[PDB]
Amino acid sequence: AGRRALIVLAHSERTSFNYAMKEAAAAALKKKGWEVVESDLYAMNFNPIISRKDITGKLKDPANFQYPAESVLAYKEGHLSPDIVAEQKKLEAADLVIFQFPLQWFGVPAILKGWFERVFIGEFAYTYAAMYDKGPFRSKKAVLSITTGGSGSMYSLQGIHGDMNVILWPIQSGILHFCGFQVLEPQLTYSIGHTPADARIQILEGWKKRLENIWDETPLYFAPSSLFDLNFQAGFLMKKEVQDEEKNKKFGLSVGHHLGKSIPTDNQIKARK
């Protein structure tokens, strides 16, 4: 299973429900014997802005700075900024990674987005030669615990905001799975600002309850890489054999791989697929 957990929190107030959720998670995991490390970005006064100062040594081409290549080279030679390296060390150590944050402008808070940009460096977090399920974090599991202002109905198929599954995709598939993470069902707590005091108590208890058997959960479904032609000249498109077999299927494979068909229900919210 997993003995180590890393909890990344993105909220400035320790009086917030998000802070309470992080505390609940840490407590529940420690009771079950987990090793729990934290990355409270606001408390760490974490720098979320990507720049050449993320590289400590001499750049290869200082007059024409390219973040991707320079950062990769710094990773391999050992000269990434030390604050970045400390986070990478936490990730390598962790089996389970929990991201706690309030939904902000239908995405991750700026400080967490900057954490991904600075910490998920090439080679370390991903490889074009081993994308998605064969990525570096393929033996790890990630989970998003989100709080929101809008009610759950606003995010249903017929709500004004639209399907929450669409909002989740860029993060869960694009950021987490691309690196190899097995992504578990998200913990969604809607309109927390309009939730009764006693209901709020249950929310915290239900979260701690779920974490007791978190590692045994079945992850969300993403189309396996074995279905794609993993080479540049082919354009990373689905292999024809697969493409044809799918032509008689009613449903697409996932949110991003809907193929023009119907997206299976709650592909990004519920496992089993």
Ligand X SMILES: CC1=C(N2CC2)C(=O)C(CO)=C(N2CC2)C1=O
Q: Is 180 annotated in the active site?
A: no
Q: Is 161 annotated in the active site?
A: yes
Breaks (C-N over 2.5 A) in the chain follow: none
Rounded to an integer, what distance in angstroms lies between the CA atom of residue 91 and that of residue 82?
14
Rounded to an integer, what distance in angstroms lies between the CA atom of residue 6 and that of residue 119?
14
Q: What is the DSSP string of 66-126?
A: -HHHHHHHHHHHT-B-HHHHHHHHHHHH-SEEEEEEE-BTTB--HHHHHHHHHHS-BTTTB
Contact pick of 105, 129, 232, 241 for ligand FAD (by CB under 6 A): 105
Least Å distance, CB 64 to ligand FAD, is 6
Collapsed DSSP state (helix, strand, coil) of residue 230: coil
Q: Is 88:126 a contact under the CB 8 Å cutoff?
A: no
Q: Is 155 annotated in the active site?
A: yes
Rounded to an integer, what distance in angstroms lies between the CA atom of residue 38 and that of residue 51?
24
In angstroms, how far is CA 15 from the centroid of its own chain? Answer: 25
Residue with tokens 């030390």: 82
Q: Candidates 18-26, 45-53, 137-145, 147-155: pick the segment binding ligand X (CB under 6 A).
A: 147-155
Which of positions 67-106 make contact with ligand X (CB under 6 A)? 68
Rounded to an integer, what distance in angstroms lies between the CA atom of residue 155 and that of residue 41?
28
Task: Check binding of 67 to ligand FAD (CB under 6 A).
Answer: yes
Task: Check binding of 193 to ligand X (CB under 6 A).
Answer: yes
Least Å distance, CB 4 to ligand FAD, is 25
Rounded to an integer, what distance in angstroms lies between the CA atom of residue 61 and that of residue 175?
28
Contact pick of 17, 99, 116, 126 for ligand X (by CB under 6 A): 126
Structure tokens at 216: 């045994």
Is residue 221 marked as binding? no
Task: Check binding of 237 to its own copies (CB under 8 A).
Answer: yes
Binding mask 78-97 toward ligand FAD (x if CB under 6 A, else -) reads --------------------
Q: What angle do CA 67, 72, 74 make, to 5 degrees?
A: 95
Q: Is 22:7 a contact under the CB 8 Å cutoff?
A: yes
Binding mask 164-203 toward ligand FAD (x if CB under 6 A, else -) reads ----------x-----------------xx------xx--
Count other C-beta atoms under 10 Å from residue 189's C-beta: 22
Which is nearer to ligand FAD, 119 or 214 (by Cβ)? 119
Q: Pick from ligand X, its own copies, ligand FAD, none: which does 126 bind, CB < 5 to 8 A by kind?
A: ligand X
Binding mask 1-40 toward ligand X (x if CB under 6 A, else -) reads ----------------------------------------
Residue numbers belonging to the annotated binding site for FAD: 11, 17-18, 66, 103-106, 147-150, 155, 200
Residue numbers belonging to the annotated binding site for substrate: 125-127
Contact positions toward ligand X, by CB under 6 A?
68, 126, 128, 149-150, 154, 193
Provide the annotated active-site residues. Answer: 149, 155, 161
Residue numbers belonging to the annotated binding site: 11, 17-18, 66, 103-106, 125-127, 147-150, 155, 200
